[PDB]
Amino acid sequence: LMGPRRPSVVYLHNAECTGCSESVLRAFEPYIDTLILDTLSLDYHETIMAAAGDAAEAALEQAVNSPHGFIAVVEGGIPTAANGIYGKVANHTMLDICSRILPKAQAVIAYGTCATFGGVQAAKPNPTGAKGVNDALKHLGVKAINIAGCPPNPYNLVGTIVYYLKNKAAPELDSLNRPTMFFGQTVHEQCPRLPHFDAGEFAPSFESEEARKGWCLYELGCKGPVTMNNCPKIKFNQTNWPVDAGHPCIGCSEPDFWDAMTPFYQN
Amino acid sequence: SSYSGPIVVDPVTRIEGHLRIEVEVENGKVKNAYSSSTLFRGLEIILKGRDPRDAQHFTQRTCGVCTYTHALASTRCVDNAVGVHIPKNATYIRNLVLGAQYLHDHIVHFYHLHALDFVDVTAALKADPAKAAKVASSISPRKTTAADLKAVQDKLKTFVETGQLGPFTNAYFLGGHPAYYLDPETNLIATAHYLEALRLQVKAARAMAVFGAKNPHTQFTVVGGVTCYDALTPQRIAEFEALWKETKAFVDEVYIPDLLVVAAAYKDWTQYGGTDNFITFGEFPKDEYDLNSRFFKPGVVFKRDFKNIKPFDKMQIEEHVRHSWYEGAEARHPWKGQTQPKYTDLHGDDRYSWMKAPRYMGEPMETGPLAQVLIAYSQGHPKVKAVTDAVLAKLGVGPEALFSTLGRTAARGIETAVIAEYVGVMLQEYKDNIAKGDNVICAPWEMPKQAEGVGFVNAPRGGLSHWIRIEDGKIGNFQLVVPSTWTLGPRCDKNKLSPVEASLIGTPVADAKRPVEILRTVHSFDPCIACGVH
Ligand code: SF4
Ligand code: SF4
Numbered sequence: 078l079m080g081p082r083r084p085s086v087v088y089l090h091n092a093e094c095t096g097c098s099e100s101v102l103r104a105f106e107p108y109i110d111t112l113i114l115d116t117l118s119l120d121y122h123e124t125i126m127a128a129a130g131d132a133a134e135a136a137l138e139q140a141v142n143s144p145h146g147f148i149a150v151v152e153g154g155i156p157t158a159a160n161g162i163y164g165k166v167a168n169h170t171m172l173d174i175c176s177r178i179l180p181k182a183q184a185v186i187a188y189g190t191c192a193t194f195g196g197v198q199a200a201k202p203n204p205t206g207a208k209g210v211n212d213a214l215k216h217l218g219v220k221a222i223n224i225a226g227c228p229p230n231p232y233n234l235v236g237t238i239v240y241y242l243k244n245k246a247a248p249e250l251d252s253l254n255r256p257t258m259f260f261g262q263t264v265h266e267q268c269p270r271l272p273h274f275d276a277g278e279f280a281p282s283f284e285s286e287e288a289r290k291g292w293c294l295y296e297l298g299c300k301g302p303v304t305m306n307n308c309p310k311i312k313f314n315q316t317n318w319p320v321d322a323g324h325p326c327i328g329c330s331e332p333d334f335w336d337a338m339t340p341f342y343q344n
Numbered sequence: 345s346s347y348s349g350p351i352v353v354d355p356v357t358r359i360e361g362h363l364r365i366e367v368e369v370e371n372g373k374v375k376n377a378y379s380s381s382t383l384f385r386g387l388e389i390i391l392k393g394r395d396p397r398d399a400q401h402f403t404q405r406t407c408g409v410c411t412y413t414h415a416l417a418s419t420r421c422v423d424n425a426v427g428v429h430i431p432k433n434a435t436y437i438r439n440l441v442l443g444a445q446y447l448h449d450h451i452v453h454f455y456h457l458h459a460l461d462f463v464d465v466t467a468a469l470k471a472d473p474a475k476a477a478k479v480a481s482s483i484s485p486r487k488t489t490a491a492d493l494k495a496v497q498d499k500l501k502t503f504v505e506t507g508q509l510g511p512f513t514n515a516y517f518l519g520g521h522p523a524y525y526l527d528p529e530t531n532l533i534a535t536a537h538y539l540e541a542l543r544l545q546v547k548a549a550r551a552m553a554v555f556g557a558k559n560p561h562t563q564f565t566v567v568g569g570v571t572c573y574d575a576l577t578p579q580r581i582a583e584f585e586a587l588w589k590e591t592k593a594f595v596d597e598v599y600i601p602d603l604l605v606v607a608a609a610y611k612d613w614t615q616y617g618g619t620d621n622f623i624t625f626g627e628f629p630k631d632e633y634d635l636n637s638r639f640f641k642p643g644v645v646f647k648r649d650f651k652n653i654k655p656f657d658k659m660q661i662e663e664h665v666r667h668s669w670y671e672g673a674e675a676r677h678p679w680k681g682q683t684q685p686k687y688t689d690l691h692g693d694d695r696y697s698w699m700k701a702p703r704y705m706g707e708p709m710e711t712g713p714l715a716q717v718l719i720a721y722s723q724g725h726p727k728v729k730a731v732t733d734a735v736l737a738k739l740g741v742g743p744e745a746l747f748s749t750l751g752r753t754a755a756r757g758i759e760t761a762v763i764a765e766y767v768g769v770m771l772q773e774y775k776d777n778i779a780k781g782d783n784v785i786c787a788p789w790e791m792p793k794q795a796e797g798v799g800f801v802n803a804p805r806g807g808l809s810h811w812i813r814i815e816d817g818k819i820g821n822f823q824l825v826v827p828s829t830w831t832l833g834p835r836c837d838k839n840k841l842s843p844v845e846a847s848l849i850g851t852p853v854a855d856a857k858r859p860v861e862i863l864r865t866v867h868s869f870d871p872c873i874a875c876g877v878h
């Protein structure tokens with residue numbers, strides 16, 4: 078699957094919805110084909126790899142044990158309740174897979190809020206005891222770079238990987254282990270409706286003429302002021318982002334946002 | 345030399361989520377099957393006690409492949425519970441984003457999830473690109489030249505000779521495989537279009553973000569309508585239209601012709617993976633409160649009796665747990681649903697999946713493109729009939745050929761073609777409506793303290809329903825019953841095999857070490873295990 082030439086990437090799926098995987102497929106300049114054929118060697122990825130079953134397990138073994146080394150990209154939270162029972166692959170708990178594999182990586186990237194902070198399945202009452210990667214594997218000295226969002230901007234994953242390859246190091250990280258080059262500003266300080274915020278011009282409802290006119294969504298729940306992400310700058314799919322679509326930010330790059338930011342339509 | 349013994353496929357790759365397939369093989373043919381879903385998250389448990397307005401944000405994270413669909417189902421469900429009738433434009437915008445979702449989803453499924461079961465990418469290196477160009481230009485109005493395909497071959501050649509095969513590592517076709525039939529040229533054409541589809545799907549997904557904020561996980565729906573005033577503008581409509589037009593051209597000129605060429609080469613696949621019963625909910629409403637107002641209509645068919653399509657009665661759905669990792673054995677109507685996990689390990693107490701087993705009047709029901717297409721056909725849907733008939737005539741097969749793995753695969757293409765055209769109709773109606781001066785996109789509503797609601801979506805994998813019981817203005821119960829739950833859930837308390845399980849009986853396996861035939865059938869259902877289990 079690998080060897081010299083291109084840097085090996087092992088992509089793992091834990092407790093996830095595959096929205097993070099799909100976000101990477103939206104990669105733009107570079108596109109995903111350039112990334113898989115030229116930039117990187119994608120040596121394990123359950124969503125798109127040809128091998129299945131024992132053949133896939135053999136592919137993963139070969140990648141992880143390569144003397145050339147690998148980068149791990151991890152999607153999904155790790156279910157830890159009932160000794161990891163709630164999530165298995167090849168009849169191995171996800172906790173066990175990640176405990177064995179991630180300490181062997183040259184670098185680990187936690188991609189998406191579930192992998193970084195626990196995410197949707199970690200929301201109260203957290204029946205599967207889901208944990209982010211660094212929380213779950215704290216004891217093994219794993220310190221993944223956290224690229225948060227639900228899903229994150231794929232610009233931020235590619236940028237982090239490119240940095241890493243170039244500099245042979247993690248970029249500057251914030252106190253949640255997120256790169257400051259992407260997560261250093263609040264969504265709000267970058268938002269086009271900030272002048273309305275400053276003037277106390279808030280939409281009182283979605284059907285209102287104030288909402289039609291693009292007034293600030295704070296009274297309708299917007300979490301932009303407490304959320305660190307690059308959404309208004311980079312946008313998604315080269316064309317839009319939640320507030321420009323008229324909907325409040327739900328805080329999706331923040332830890333525990335499912336419980337901290339709810340109810341989503343209140344501030 | 346025919347194998348007798350077990351085969352386990354874990355993980356099943358090139359699906360969404362975590363699936364373990366177990367079969368018993370006798371004399372080289374599957375005699376028995378188990379569909380084992382091995383991740384649970386518990387979104388229904390998590391939703392209890394929360395604000396019903398928050399449900400769609402949580403449930404959209406059921407699945408990022410079938411992104412939006414759950415946000416739509418939850419919003420339809422709470423709209424219904426609340427009794428709001430959303431504006432005409434909210435229905436158009438919601439419908440248009442859903443049509444765009446189907447195109448994106450089915451194109452990625454055929455190329456990036458399914459095709460490696462049928463395409464030997466490495467034999468494309470053996471191909472004559474001039475011959476290949478001739479073939480490609482004969483099946484499509486799109487002209488392809490030798491240089492076009494040589495560029496693909498050159499790229500692949502450089503990739504393979506680096507010895508880092510990446511996603512093709514240990515592919516079942518490496519070295520050759522008796523169940524892989526395509527000639528090198530056709531492999532090259534399919535491989536070229538696989539690569540092309542990697543960039544086209546960016547545009548197909550972008551179409552959703554034009555109105556829907558972002559893909560994955562749209563953020564434009566609210567109880568009462570939508571939020572995206574910008575979607576009324578000529579510029580955003582033009583942007584959507586341009587992406588739609590390019591996506592439809594890809595469907596029409598690239599996907600469907602490739603689908604037909606592969607089907608024609610694998611015509612033996614009309615003989616495997618049939619099912620008996622079908623359920624579909626309809627999609628693309630004119631009236632949010634009448635399923636029969638949808639462009640595709642709901643229906644139920646038992647034992648392939650399409651002459652007696654039964655009406656869909658939402659009270660006849662029950663979800664079984666006897667062979668699932670939940671407490672007890674009692675099936676439940678989703679308005680009385682229960683999600684009480686209790687793990688017993690594989691076949692412990694005859695339980696082997698985190699999926700519940702939905703049954704309709706006690707029967708296991710296939711849902712998805714084959715159900716939607718066959719029921720629509722049988723209802724006299726003129727667009728479905730014309731595409732279906734053309735496909736059948738091009739393949740030189742009769743209607744019974746549709747009851748199979750190949751048929752199901754073909755139906756996914758048929759639905760893509762029909763929806764791609766219907767998106768243009770909806771777009772025009774939307775424009776027309778704006779032009780009459782209707783600029784309203786959200787309606788006011790009030791939260792009842794006590795209510796029940798249900799929302800129905802026919803998603804790319806079939807009939808999706810979200811069910812709420814509101815108590816004290818909060819979520820008292822919230823149950824998802826998802827298309828892959830129907831199709832890939834386990835046996836019920838009557839021990840009836842689910843559609844995937846039953847369809848696997850009879851599958852030939854040439855090489856037990858490389859059981860691509862099992863993948864072909866399983867993949868034809870387009871499984872989504874995050875969806876099915878939630
Ligand atoms: S972070 Fe969000 S999008 Fe990504 S796997 Fe988790 S629920 Fe899905
Ligand atoms: S819409 Fe949200 S992010 Fe924008 S100014 Fe208002 S509170 Fe801030």
Ligand code: F3S
Pocket residue numbers: 226227264304305306308318319320325326327328329330
């Ligand atoms: S909901 Fe998430 S995608 Fe950006 S606008 Fe808010 S951090």
Ligand SMILES: [Mg+2]
Pocket residue numbers: 388700823824825826877878
């Ligand atoms: Mg359910």
